[PDB]
Each structure stands twice: as structure tokens, then as C-alpha cells.
């Protein structure tokens, strides 16, 4: 109820992928996407990133829980700002 649609994630193994993070977060509700912070000196991620959610009603529990399992390693998550891309303005059009 009036929370944000995204979260921060940190403590990831170098073994863990962006697709692993996207998969492991789906246990609470639909994850739309995930991304990681890459180091251009190594082309590996720094052990941290972000996850996009279908609804802020899911994100409330995800962000309330401090620690989350990914590839059996535990990581923490935190608040992150939303981004506008959806549109609710559909209509139930039809005829007899």
C-alpha cells in the first residue's frame, strides 16, 4: 500500500548470475527484471544490484525480510526508487 516497485540487493557471490537473482526473488510474487553493478576493470559484478517487482504489495514483504537465499548464499535487500513504464488505462470493450 503506497510502497515502491523496486529493491536494492547486496552480498552476492561472483558465482551468481543476474538470471539467478531474477529466479530466486520470484518466491514472493512476479519479478519483472533484475540488474547488477558491473566493474569495467574486470567485467564482473561488484556483489550488488537491483530487482524490479510487478506490485509494491509484494515489495513490502521482500524489503521487510532482511536476508534472502540465492544459490544457497544469503544476501540482504533494501529500498529502491520506482520507474514509470506501465499504463492502467485499458477498457472492457465488446458487443452483443
Curated annotation (Swiss-Prot):
Compartment list: Cytoplasm; Nucleus
Provide one Gene Ontology biological process annotation: response to hormone
Q: What is its main location?
A: cytoplasm
Known tissue expression:
Expressed in neural stem and progenitor cells (at protein level). Detected in olfactory bulb, brain stem, small intestine, and at low levels in brain cortex, hippocampus and ovary. Detected in neural progenitor cells, including neural stem cells.
Q: Which residues form the RRM domain?
A: 5-82
Please list the residues that carry the modification Phosphoserine.
87
Query: Does the UniProt entry include the keyword RNA-binding?
Result: yes
| UniProt-recorded Gene Ontology molecular function terms | identical protein binding; molecular condensate scaffold activity; poly(U) RNA binding; protein homodimerization activity; single-stranded RNA binding
Q: Name one GO cellular component term.
A: cytoplasm
Q: Which superkingdom heads the taxonomic lineage of this protein's source?
A: Eukaryota
Any idea which UniProt keywords this protein has? Acetylation, Cytoplasm, Nucleus, Phosphoprotein, Repeat, RNA-binding
General function of this protein: RNA binding protein that regulates the expression of target mRNAs at the translation level. Regulates expression of the NOTCH1 antagonist NUMB. Binds RNA containing the sequence 5'-GUUAGUUAGUUAGUU-3' and other sequences containing the pattern 5'-[GA]U(1-3)AGU-3'. May play a role in the proliferation and maintenance of stem cells in the central nervous system.
Record's comment describing the protein's domains:
The first RNA recognition motif binds more strongly to RNA compared to the second one.
Query: Could you say which protein family the record assigns here?
Result: Belongs to the Musashi family.
Q: What is this protein called?
A: RNA-binding protein Musashi homolog 1
Amino acid at each position: 500500500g503506497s510502497h515502491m516497485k523496486k529493491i536494492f540487493v547486496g552480498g552476492l557471490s561472483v558465482n551468481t548470475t543476474v538470471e539467478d537473482v531474477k529466479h530466486y526473488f520470484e518466491q514472493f510474487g512476479k519479478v519483472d527484471d533484475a540488474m547488477l553493478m558491473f566493474d569495467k576493470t574486470t567485467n564482473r559484478h561488484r556483489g550488488f544490484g537491483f530487482v524490479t517487482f510487478e506490485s509494491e504489495d509484494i515489495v513490502e514483504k521482500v524489503c521487510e525480510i532482511h536476508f534472502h537465499e540465492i544459490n544457497n548464499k544469503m544476501v540482504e535487500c533494501k529500498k529502491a526508487q520506482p520507474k514509470e513504464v506501465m499504463s492502467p488505462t485499458g477498457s472492457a470493450r465488446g458487443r452483443s
